[PDB]
C-alpha cells in the first residue's frame, strides 16, 4: 500500500481557441487567473474522463521495458495554488505506487473526452528520498482511440542519448520513431510527425497554366531548404506538385494558440489577404477611392485623416477578431493607418542622403553593405559580357564636396563602399521589365565621410539588352544633386536603388535566411533528439510557432495568388529567385563575425572586443548584434561543455549524430555535398552551429523584421516596386519631374492599393504579441531539473540586461549618430526586452511572425 499525490495542470481549449477566444477583444494578462475550478465545468474530467498511468524508471520488467503501475483516473479540482496561472485548471489524483516498483520518470495520458485539452505539467510528490517530480509536458490531448499509441510524457531530468534509465530506454526509441512517421498519407490536424517534402505547394495549375510555378528544391536549377512535409493528393494537371488547401497541416504543438485574441497575429495575415484584400480590391474598382496618390501630402493623410473607405467593406472588415486596434476608424467611412517612427520627428528628413545611407547600417536590411577591395565593382555572372567586363562607374565620378583624395587612397585606407543588387535581378530582368512593372539592376557606392557619415557618390542604374544580350552592360550612373531636375532626377535614382533592397530583402534576407532556413532543424531536431536530450532542450524554445507562420506563408503570402508577388519587385518570380539566391547560401557564414568578415566590414584583431576590428566602426546593427551574438556563444558554450565530456563522448552520440546526418543529407539536402558543413566531431563545432542556429531565429530575424512598419510604413521610403523608367530629354515625363516631381515620383513607385496592401502586411509583422517569450532569460517554465544549466541560463539572463542597459547608453552617445540620424530614429532593434504592441525593439526567443 502507498499513494503517491499528483496535480494535473492542464487548459481547456476554449480558453485558448481563436473562434472561441473571439470575447477577449480587451486585457487579459490574468483577470482573476480563473482556475476553471470557479464555475465548475471542470467536473467534466472527474468521471472516467481522463487516466494517467505511470511508469518506472528504476524498474524493468521481464524483457527491457519499464513498469506501469496501474491506469488512475483524475479527480477533484484544486481550487487554488499558489503557482497557478491565468486559463489553468488543475486537478487532484493518487497513484498507488509500491517501492519494487522503483522510482517514476514518465507517464501515459488517455483523454476519452473527445474535446481535446492542453496538458500544461504533472507534479508528483514522492515516496522514497526524492523531492518533487515535475513534468514538463505543454501538449495537446486528443481523443485516446485515434492514436494507435498512448501519448507518453517524460520527467524533468535531461539525459543523453545513452537514453540513460535502462527501463526507459525503450520508451525513448518508439516516441522518436512515432515522432517520424513513415513517411505516408495525408497528414491530419491531430497528429505529430515530422518528415520533409520540397516546396510544391506553392503554386496551382489546376486553375491555369499561368498558375503554376517552379518546384523549389529537389533539383540543381533551384536549389531550396525542404518544408514541413503535409500530405494531401496531386494536382490534376501536375503530380509533382501538391494540391492547394485552405488548411495545412503541421505537427500539432507547434501551432501555439493564445489566452487574448489580438495575439493570434497569423489569423491577422490569413484574414487580410482574405476578406480585407478581395474587399478592397472592389473600392479601387470603382470610385469612392482615387487609384494614384496625386501629392506627398496624401501618402502622409493615412495616418492622420486616414482613407475615408465605404461602409460596403469598412464594416465588413470591422468585427474580424486581431484586426482590433490595427485597421483605425473614426467609425464610419475611415481606414486609417498609425504613423512610423521614420517621419515623427520629421516627415521630410527621409529624402536626405543620409537617411539613404544610414539605412544601411541601421536600416531593415543592414546587412548586405561591404567594403570595395578593388574598383570598379565586377558582375558574378558568366560569359555575357558585362559579367566578363564590370560596372561602367568611372574613376572620374568619385569624390565630391566632403574630403578629395584618390579613388585607391579611398580603398587602400577602406572608406569605399558598395551596395550591389545588379546579378540577382539581371537573369530576370527582361521578364520582369515586359510585364507592368519597369525595373533596373543597380549598383550603388558610397563613402565614408570624415565624420563617420556615409554619403552617396554614384548609382549606376543597369538595363539588359544593350543590343540583344551578351554585353547587358546597358548602364548609366546618376550622382548626388540638391536642386533643380538632377535632384528630382537623384531622388528618382533612390528610389530605383531602395525599390530593389527591399525585395532582396523581401524573400532573401527575411523569408529565406530566416523563416525557409530555420525549418529544416525543427524538423530533423523534432525526429531524433529526444525531449529528454541537452540539445533538445537548449533548442526547442527558438522553434517556437515557426512552422506555423511558414505554413501561412506557404498559403498567403509567398503563393501564387499570394500578397508577396503583387506587392514586390520580382513579381511572380520572386521565390524562384530566392532559390537562385540559395545556391550562394553557406551556413557558417551565417554567424554574425563571419558575416562581416566576408564582406569586409570587418577584419580580425584580437587587441579588439571581441577579436575583430571594425571598418566603420559607427555601424548600429554591427556594433550591437556582436555583443549579443557574444551573449548567444558565451551560453551554448558553458551548456554543451556542461553535458558532454569530450569530443568521443559527442561522436558516439546517436541522436544527435543522426539528427546532423539527416539535416545536411536531407533538411538541405540539394547542399549535402558541400564541403564547409560542420562534421559533428568536435564539442565546439556543436556550440558553432547551436550558436547559428539561435542568432538566426532571435537576433538576426529581429534586426530583419520589426523595423519593417518604422521604416517601411511610409510607402516613400521603402518603395516595393517601380513602374516607370527614368524620364530622358524634353519627354511630357521629363517635363513633369519640372512641374510636379511629387507625381512624377508616385508615378514610378507602388500604386495606392499595393501600398495598402503592403503597409497592412508589414504592420502585423512588425508587432509583438503580448505573450512574446524573448531572448531575455526568458523560458516558459523549469524545462529541467539541472541546476547548473539552470544557473547557467541565469548567468545569460543577467548579461542581456547588462547589454539592454549597454545599449541605451550607446543610442544616447551624441557622436554615434548613425544610431539616430536625421531621422531621430534611436536604432533600438537590438534591445532584448520589449512590451507588447509597435515597438521598435525586441527580441524573440524565435521567427513567431
Ligand atoms: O513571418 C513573415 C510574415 C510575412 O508576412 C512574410 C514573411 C515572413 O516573409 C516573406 C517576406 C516578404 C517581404 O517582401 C517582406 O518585406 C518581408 O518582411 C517578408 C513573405 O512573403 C511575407
Ligand atoms: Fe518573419
Redo the contacts with the bound molecule.
Keep these: 500500500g502507498h499513494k503517491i499525490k499528483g496535480t494535473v495542470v492542464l487548459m481547456r481549449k476554449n480558453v485558448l481557441d481563436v473562434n472561441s477566444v473571439t470575447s477577449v477583444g480587451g486585457i487579459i494578462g490574468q483577470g482573476l487567473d480563473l482556475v476553471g475550478s470557479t464555475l465548475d465545468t471542470l467536473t467534466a474530467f472527474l468521471g472516467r474522463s481522463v487516466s494517467l498511468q505511470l511508469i518506472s524508471a528504476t524498474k524493468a520488467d521481464a524483457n527491457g521495458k519499464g513498469k506501469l503501475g496501474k491506469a488512475t483516473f483524475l479527480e477533484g479540482i484544486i481550487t487554488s495554488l499558489p503557482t497557478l496561472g491565468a486559463g489553468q485548471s488543475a486537478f487532484k489524483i493518487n497513484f498507488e505506487w509500491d517501492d519494487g516498483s522503483g522510482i517514476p520518470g514518465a507517464f501515459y495520458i488517455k483523454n476519452f473526452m473527445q474535446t481535446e485539452f492542453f496538458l500544461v505539467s504533472l507534479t508528483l510528490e514522492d515516496i522514497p528520498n526524492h523531492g518533487s517530480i515535475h513534468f514538463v509536458c505543454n501538449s495537446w490531448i486528443y481523443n485516446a482511440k485515434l492514436f494507435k499509441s498512448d501519448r507518453i510524457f517524460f520527467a524533468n531530468q535531461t539525459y543523453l542519448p545513452s537514453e540513460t534509465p535502462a527501463p526507459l530506454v525503450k520508451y525513448r526509441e518508439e516516441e522518436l520513431h512515432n515522432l517520424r512517421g513513415d513517411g505516408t498519407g495525408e497528414r491530419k490536424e491531430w497528429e505529430r510527425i515530422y518528415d520533409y517534402d520540397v516546396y510544391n505547394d506553392l503554386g496551382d495549375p489546376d486553375k491555369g497554366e499561368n498558375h503554376a510555378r517552379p518546384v523549389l528544391g529537389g533539383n540543381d536549377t533551384f536549389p531550396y531548404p525542404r518544408r514541413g512535409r503535409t500530405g494531401r493528393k496531386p494536382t490534376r494537371k501536375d503530380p509533382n506538385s501538391e494540391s492547394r488547401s485552405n488548411d495545412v497541416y503541421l505537427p500539432r504543438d507547434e501551432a501555439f494558440g493564445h489566452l487574448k485574441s489580438s495575439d493570434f497575429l497569423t489569423y491577422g495575415?490569413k484574414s487580410v489577404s482574405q476578406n480585407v484584400l478581395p474587399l478592397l480590391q472592389s473600392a479601387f474598382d470603382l470610385n469612392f477611392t482615387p487609384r494614384e496618390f496625386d501629392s506627398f501630402d496624401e501618402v502622409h493623410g493615412l495616418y492622420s485623416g486616414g482613407i475615408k473607405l465605404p461602409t460596403d467593406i469598412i464594416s465588413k472588415i470591422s468585427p474580424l477578431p486581431v484586426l482590433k486596434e490595427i485597421f483605425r476608424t473614426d467609425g464610419e467611412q475611415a481606414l486609417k493607418f498609425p504613423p512610423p517612427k521614420v517621419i515623427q520627428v520629421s516627415k521630410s528628413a527621409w529624402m536626405t542622403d543620409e537617411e539613404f545611407a544610414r539605412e544601411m547600417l541601421a536600416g531593415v536590411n543592414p546587412n548586405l553593405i561591404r567594403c570595395l577591395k578593388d574598383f570598379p565593382p565586377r558582375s558574378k555572372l558568366d560569359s555575357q559580357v558585362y559579367g566578363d567586363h564590370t560596372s561602367q562607374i568611372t574613376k572620374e565620378h568619385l569624390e565630391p564636396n566632403l574630403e578629395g583624395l584618390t579613388v585607391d587612397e579611398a580603398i587602400q585606407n577602406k572608406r569605399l563602399f558598395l551596395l550591389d543588387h545588379h546579378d540577382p535581378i539581371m537573369p530576370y530582368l527582361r521578364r520582369i521589365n515586359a510585364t507592368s512593372t519597369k525595373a533596373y539592376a543597380t549598383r550603388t557606392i558610397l563613402f565614408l565621410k570624415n565624420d563617420g557619415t556615409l554619403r552617396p557618390l554614384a548609382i549606376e542604374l543597369s538595363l539588359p539588352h544593350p543590343q540583344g544580350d551578351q554585353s547587358g552592360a546597358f548602364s548609366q550612373v546618376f550622382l548626388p544633386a540638391d536642386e533643380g531636375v538632377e535632384s528630382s532626377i537623384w531622388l528618382l535614382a533612390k528610389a530605383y536603388v531602395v525599390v530593389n533592397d527591399?525585395?532582396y530583402?523581401?524573400?532573401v534576407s527575411?523569408?529565406l535566411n530566416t523563416?525557409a532556413v530555420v525549418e529544416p532543424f525543427i524538423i530533423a531536431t523534432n525526429r531524433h533528439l529526444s525531449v529528454v536530450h541537452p540539445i533538445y532542450k537548449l533548442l526547442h524554445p527558438h522553434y517556437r510557432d515557426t512552422m506555423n507562420?511558414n505554413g501561412l506563408?506557404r498559403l498567403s503570402?509567398?503563393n501564387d495568388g499570394?500578397?508577396?508577388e503583387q506587392?514586390?519587385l520580382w513579381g511572380r518570380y520572386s521565390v524562384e529567385m530566392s532559390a537562385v539566391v540559395y545556391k550562394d547560401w553557406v551556413f557558417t557564414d551565417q554567424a554574425l563575425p563571419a558575416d562581416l568578415i566576408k564582406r569586409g566590414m570587418a577584419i580580425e584583431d584580437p587587441s579588439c572586443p571581441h577579436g575583430i576590428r571594425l571598418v566603420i566602426e559607427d555601424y548600429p546593427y554591427t556594433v550591437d548584434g556582436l555583443e549579443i551574438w557574444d551573449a548567444i556563444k558565451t551560453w551554448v558554450h558553458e551548456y554543451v561543455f556542461l553535458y558532454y565530456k569530450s569530443d568521443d563522448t559527442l561522436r558516439e552520440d546517436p541522436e544527435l549524430q543522426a539528427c546532423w546526418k539527416e539535416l545536411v543529407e536531407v533538411g538541405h539536402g540539394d547542399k549535402k555535398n558541400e564541403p564547409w558543413w560542420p562534421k559533428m566531431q568536435t564539442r565546439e563545432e556543436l556550440v558553432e552551429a547551436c550558436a547559428i542556429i539561435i542568432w538566426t531565429a532571435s537576433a538576426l530575424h529581429a534586426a530583419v523584421?520589426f523595423g519593417?512598419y518604422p521604416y517601411g510604413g511610409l510607402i516613400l521610403n521603402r518603395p516595393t516596386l517601380s513602374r516607370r523608367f527614368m524620364p530622358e530629354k524634353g519627354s511630357a515625363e521629363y517635363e513633369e519631374l519640372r512641374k510636379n516631381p511629387q507625381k512624377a515620383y508616385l508615378k514610378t513607385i507602388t500604386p495606392k492599393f499595393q501600398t495598402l496592401i503592403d503597409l497592412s502586411?508589414?504592420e502585423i509583422?512588425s508587432r509583438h504579441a503580448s505573450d512574446e517569450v524573448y531572448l531575455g532569460e526568458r523560458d516558459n517554465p523549469n524545462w529541467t531539473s539541472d541546476t547548473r544549466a539552470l544557473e547557467a541560463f541565469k548567468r545569460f539572463g543577467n548579461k542581456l540586461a547588462q547589454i539592454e542597459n549597454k545599449l541605451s547608453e550607446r543610442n544616447n552617445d551624441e557622436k554615434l549618430r548613425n544610431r539616430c540620424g536625421p531621422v531621430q530614429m534611436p536604432y533600438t532593434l537590438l534591445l532584448p526586452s520589449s512590451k507588447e504592441g509597435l515597438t521598435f525593439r525586441g527580441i524573440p526567443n524565435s521567427?513567431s511572425?
Design positions: 495575415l527591399s525585395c530583402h523581401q524573400l527575411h523569408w523563416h507562420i506563408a503570402l509567398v499570394g500578397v508577396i506587392t514586390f523584421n519593417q502586411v508589414i509583422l521567427i511572425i
